[PDB]
Structure formats: C-alpha cells, structure tokens
Design a protein around this ligand. Structure first.
Ligand SMILES: CC#CCN1C(=O)c2ccc(S(N)(=O)=O)cc2S1(=O)=O
Ligand SMILES: CC#CCN1C(=O)c2ccc(S(N)(=O)=O)cc2S1(=O)=O
Ligand SMILES: [Zn+2]
Ligand SMILES: [Zn+2]
Lengths: 251, 251
C-alpha cells in the first residue's frame, strides 16, 4: 500500500472500512466536557544521551524507537509504556496533519504510540479496546527554531533513502509535546494506516507545538518515500465519527 | 473462599489486594457528569421459553447462565455479550447490596456480567481494560409484586442445597433490570470475588427495581451455602475509590 496512490485501503485491509476509524475531525463545541479526564502522567521520558535510539525511514514516516521505561497513565491504574513515535506532514505550502480541528489541517502532527501494561506484546493489544494509546500533538509554524525537534530534523538528511536508519543520542521525549497535560481531546479509534486496527485510545492535545519554517520545510522536503518518489502528504483523510462523541478534559 | 471466614482473599488471589476494587460507595455529589455516556442498548434479551437456562446455587450466589446472542453496547464501538447474571442479598431486616449510595445499602443487587466482543473467553479478558462489563441494579422493597423476578424466585426452593441447579425457561432478561437505560453511574473496578481482576467497567443504574417484601424474603431465606448455614449477606465490603472518579450519564 502507498499514501495517495492505490491500492484502495479496504482492498489491502478490510479493517480500514470499519465504523470507528481514525483520524477524525475535532469540532470542540460538539466535544463533551468530561471532568473525570485527569492530567496525563508521563514518567521516564527524560532520556540521557546513551544509549542511542534507532531512527529509521520506513517509507511511510520517520520513526524513533523508544526504549523500555517510558511510562504513561490516561487515568488511575490505566497505564501504558511508550514503544515509538513518528510524524505526519504535508508538502511545500500544504499541511499534512492527520487530525483536523473544525476543518483546519495543521502543518504536521506527532504521534507517540504506547502499549497497555495489561498486554505483554503489541499483537495481543491490536484490536482490543484500550490495548494501544497514541498521544497526538499538532505542529504549527511559529517564529523560533524548536531545539527539541532539531535533534531529529538535523538527522533526517542521513536517512533520506526509504529503508535507511541511524542511531541518534537520547533526548527528552516529553520536550516534543505541548505544555498543558491537563487539556486534551480523547476518543477511541484505529491505526491510521493498515491494518487499521480499532480500539486505539486517541488523546489529542488542545495545545500546539511550534516549529520554524526551516524546520517544517526540512521535514517535508528531506525524505524520499516508495519508488523514485518524495515522502510527503503521509496522512489519512478524516473519518466519520459514526456516533462517537469526542471528549474534552476542559470546558 | 467464602464471606465471613478464611481463607483471606489475597492469599487466594493477589489481585484482591489491588488498589482499584469493587464494590464502591457512590456519592452522587462527587460524580462527574459526562454527556458522552449515552443510553445503554441491549439486543436478544427477550428470550423464548426454549431452550432452557441453567440456574445454579454455587454456594456464593444464585446464578443464571445466559445463552449466546445477548448483545450489549455501553456506547458506539463498546460492545459486549452477556455471560450470566446473579444476585447479592442480605437477611431478615438487613440489606445486602454490594454497592451503596451515600452509605445507604439497598436490600439486594442484580449483576449482569458481560464479555468484550474483542475476547473469545473470560480468561483472556481478566485484568484487561474494558474486558468484562457488569450491569448492576439495586432491588428495593416495593408495594406490588414483580412478575419478572417471580419466574426465578419460585425456583429457588429446588436449588436450596449448595452446589445444586435446575433448568428454568428463558425470559425477558431485560425485565429484570430498570426501564431507564439513560441514567446511570459508570466506573472502572474489579470483580467482587477471587480472582478480583481489575479493568472491569461497572455501570450502576440509579433507577431501582421493585420486589414485594415476600419476594425479598424468598431470596434471602431460601438458599443454603457452605456448612450448615444459610446463604445470606453475600456482598463484599465497600472498597475505597482511591482517586477514581465515578461518572454520571446525567447532570
Ligand atoms: C501490524 C502492526 C503494527 C504496528 N503499527 C502500525 O502499523 C501503525 C500504523 C499507524 C500508527 S499511527 N498513525 O500512530 O496510528 C501506528 C502504528 S503501530 O502500532 O506502530
Ligand atoms: C476465572 C473466572 C471467571 C468468571 N467470573 C468470576 O470469577 C466472577 C466473580 C465475580 C463477579 S461479580 N460478583 O459480578 O463481580 C462475576 C464473575 S464472572 O466473570 O462470571
Ligand atoms: Zn501516526
Ligand atoms: Zn456480583
């Protein structure tokens, strides 16, 4: 399968035509204030410089392999451990966030993928409710160079070829995420690529994160995808809610 | 394991010493109104007389094994299928519900235990997020007699012995529950007997079900448990929320 260019995704993966798919369009005034949504807890994310982390070009995105010990909680006793993170982005002049807010698509989007501590392996967790949790944040253009993201973007050139990978030194993973861990949207959806497994809890931060133009450009323009072809516009059209009510941690 | 004496429940099952156990004390004052909680939807609960259902005195409760085909959804994409239902009660002039409201203990309580459609069987579901779900309703003393419960209560004589069972014709299982599926409390808890696995979603109706006084005597008076003792006060001690917030489908 490929981003923008058949095969159609149900042909390759019928799950992708399920009723509860991701990403989705967030319409904050139809979201539901749920006071029981407490602040996110992220421990162990402040990594030292060694060991090094694997950063690969998989042709569908750039992916950082996170080590054991990144622990996350959506609620009391509802804990997770981070596996990896990756990005989604547009092209020159065009946005490529997966999730949108009232129609507005953001320049790019970070996804940090976690596994319920109730499941030992990802493949037990796939398809099961709550088995996987993704923290999503939006990246926009702001006036300043973002130093947390620079640590990755400055390494993009070395893995421009589809399938190539490099070791980067450890970074503070939490530094790539927004400021208020108490302000987010949450719904249950799916993987946004095949196999499109449902049961994924999606937490989308209410706050954005700001990158320079040199940094967003670097993100879309540096990487080569499948075929003699650029890795760009690697997002999925927003999917219908089909009766799902998006929740908000804030009024 | 039993209610009143040894063995102690953590010595049986380690999970019975978990932080997030059931039952709890529902203080509506502190419940988070959550407008994403829509009305519950049952399917296939209106059973014909054949096939018949096994009703058992397992020495801890009276338990009705339910057939295939009984579908329940907590909301869009949160789908379960019913396994069994059972009862908790007190004694003469003593209440026996597991859950209490602002300290109030009700005469008895019906549990309807469900399995997430993501799991083929209970052992896969235990301890997993949302793996099992229980619908709980309180039974109160009422003026007129309940004809739905008379179908079951009239058969208790036949299973007085501990470990005995009978076969009863099918019935509207939903008529054993309140008519209002829209107004409820929801929280994440445990099973209230070993192995006491967490990750269980408890939905507690605020509408009660009404049984005549004799019916409540029939329930509490008829059955025999371990030793030469009646089966009575077969509820577990109220457990602390330990930071969990109960949600409410209504303001
Ligand atoms: C099979 C398998 C697997 C692992 N994953 C994916 O394919 C996939 C696709 C999209 C995402 S995304 N856009 O975060 O949901 C995450 C994953 S994954 O769990 O790491
Ligand atoms: C192992 C196994 C099993 C099945 N179940 C239990 O042990 C248990 C305990 C308490 C309840 S209760 N009192 O409703 O929580 C229900 C079940 S069960 O799922 O049918
Ligand atoms: Zn993604
Ligand atoms: Zn019970």
């Amino acid at each position: 399968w490929r981003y923008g260019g058949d095969p159609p995704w149900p042909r390759v993966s019928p799950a992708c035509a399920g009723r509860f798919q991701s990403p989705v369009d967030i319409r904050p005034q139809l979201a539901a204030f749920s006071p029981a949504l407490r602040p996110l807890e992220l421990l162990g994310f402040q990594l030292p410089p060694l060991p090094e982390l694997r950063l690969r070009n998989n042709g569908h995105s750039v992916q950082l392999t996170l080590p054991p010990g990144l622990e996350m909680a959506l609620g009391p006793g509802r804990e997770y451990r981070a596996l990896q993170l990756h990005l989604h982005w547009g092209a020159a002049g065009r946005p490529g966030s997966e999730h949108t807010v009232e129609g507005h698509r953001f320049p790019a989007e970070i996804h940090v993928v976690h596994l319920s501590t109730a499941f030992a392996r990802v493949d037990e967790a796939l398809g099961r409710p709550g088995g996987l949790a993704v923290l999503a944040a939006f990246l926009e253009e702001g006036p300043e160079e973002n130093s947390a993201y620079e640590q990755l973007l400055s390494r993009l050139e070395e893995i421009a070829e589809e399938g190539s990978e490099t070791q980067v030194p450890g970074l503070d993973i939490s530094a790539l995420l927004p400021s208020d861990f108490s302000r987010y949207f949450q719904y249950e959806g799916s993987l946004t690529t095949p196999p499109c497994a449902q049961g994924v809890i999606w937490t989308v931060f209410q706050q954005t994160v700001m990158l320079s133009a040199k940094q967003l450009h670097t993100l879309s323009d540096t990487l080569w995808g499948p075929g003699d072809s650029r890795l760009q516009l690697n997002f999925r059209a927003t999917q219908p809610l089909n009766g799902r009510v998006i929740e908000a941690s804030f009024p």
